[PDB]
Design a protein around this ligand. Structure first.
Ligand SMILES: *[C@@H]1O[C@H](CO)[C@@H](O[C@@H]2O[C@H](CO)[C@@H](O)[C@H](O)[C@H]2NC(C)=O)[C@H](O)[C@H]1NC(C)=O
Ligand SMILES: *[C@@H]1O[C@H](CO)[C@@H](O)[C@H](O)[C@H]1NC(C)=O
Ligand SMILES: *[C@@H]1O[C@H](CO)[C@@H](O)[C@H](O)[C@H]1NC(C)=O
Lengths: 50, 50
């Protein structure tokens, strides 16, 4: 079975590439500008830097 | 070399503000602590205070 006519087709291929460059401050989310809560938080160490 | 999203220590609060309702009435502590008669336990008294 041999083709005698053809066609040129166009297809769309969608690919995600990036995401929203989120960033988080622990102190606001967890404590909310409260120094005492931050002081208690310091006992946890390097979770937030991580 | 580079850019760093540093933690947020720059500003710290300085003073306090206290706001309360404008009531000068003294509460009737006497009428409950300094009472001629207390209710018996089965019929304990319930006093609204306001
Ligand atoms: C091969 O096939 C293509 C279609 O895939 C043909 O193109 C059509 O031909 C008809 C008849 O000649 C026209 O009415 C259409 O307008 C043509 N298409 C377009 C987009 O213009 C082509 O003619 C065929 N060739 C042969 C030799 O059969
Ligand atoms: C209480 O309310 C009155 C009227 O709203 C206002 O003038 C007054 O400054 C307030 N505070 C005190 C202590 O009365
Ligand atoms: C309760 O009674 C005692 C003595 O009767 C009195 O010294 C005291 O001031 C009274 N309490 C109040 C709140 O006035």
């Amino acid at each position: 079975a041999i083709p005698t006519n053809f066609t040129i087709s166009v297809t769309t291929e969608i690919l995600p590439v990036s995401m929203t460059k989120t960033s988080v401050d622990c102190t606001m989310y967890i404590c909310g500008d409260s120094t005492e809560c931050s002081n208690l938080l310091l006992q946890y160490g390097s979770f937030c830097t991580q | 070399k580079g850019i760093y999203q540093t933690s947020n220590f720059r500003v710290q609060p300085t003073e306090s503000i206290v706001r309360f309702p404008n009531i000068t009435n003294l509460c009737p502590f006497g009428e409950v602590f300094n009472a001629t008669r207390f209710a018996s336990v089965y019929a304990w008294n319930r006093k609204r205070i306001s």
